[model samples]
Target: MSIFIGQLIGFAVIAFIIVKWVVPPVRTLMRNQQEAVRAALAESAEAAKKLADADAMHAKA
Candidate 1:
C-alpha cells in the first residue's frame, strides 16, 4: 500500500510538469504547422487555377 501511494505521487508530479510546461509549446508548434499547411493549400489552389486559365488560352489559340 505504501509503495502504491509513492508511485501515484510520482506519476502525479510527472503529469503535472508535462501538462504545465511541455504541452503549451507542443500545441503552439502544431498550430503553426497547421497554419502553414493551410497557406500552402491555398497557394496550390491559386496555381492550379492559373494553370487551367493558361491551358484554356492555349486551346483557344
Candidate 2:
C-alpha cells in the first residue's frame, strides 16, 4: 500500500510537469508548422499559374 502511494505521487508530479512545461512548446511548434505548410501551398499555386502563363506565351510564339 505504501509503495502504491509513492508511485501515485510520482505519477502526479510527472504529469504536472509535462502539462505545465512540455505541452506548450509542442503546441506552438505544430502551429508554426501548419502556417509554414499553408504559405508553401500558396507559393506553389502562384508558381503554377506563372508556369502556365509562360507555357501559353511560348506556344503563341
Candidate 3:
C-alpha cells in the first residue's frame, strides 16, 4: 500500500511538470509552425498573381 501511494504521488508530480513546463512550449511551437505555413502560402499566392500579370503584359506587347 505504501509503495502504491508513493507511485501515485510520483505520477502526479510528473503530470504537473508536463502540464507546467512542457505543454506551453509545444503549443507555441505548433502555433509558430502554423503561422509560418500561412505566410508561405500567402507569399506563393502573391508571386503567382505577379507572374500572371507579367505574362499578360508580355502577351499584350
State the lDDT at 27 in candidate 2: 99
Question: What digit string (tens of lDDT, one per residue) describes model 3 on residues 1-61?
Answer: 8999999999999999999999999999999999999999999999999999999999999
Looking at candidate 3, the ten consecutive residues that score lowest on lDDT are 19-28
Assess the local accuracy of residue 49 in candidate 3 as a C-alpha lDDT between 0 and 100.
100
Greater TM-score among 1 and 2 belongs to 1
lDDT of 1 at 32: 100
What TM-score does candidate 1 get on C-alpha atoms? 0.74
CA lDDT of 31 in candidate 1?
Answer: 100
Residue 54 of model 3 has an lDDT of 100
Model 3 residue 53 distance off true place after TM-score fit, in angstroms? 1.7
lDDT (Cα, tens digit) per residue for candidate 2, span 1-61: 8999999999999999999999999999999999999999999999999999999999999
Any runs in candidate 1 off by more than 4 Å, and if so which? 52-61
Listed per candidate, the RMSD to the true structure in angstroms reads 2.1, 2.3, 1.7
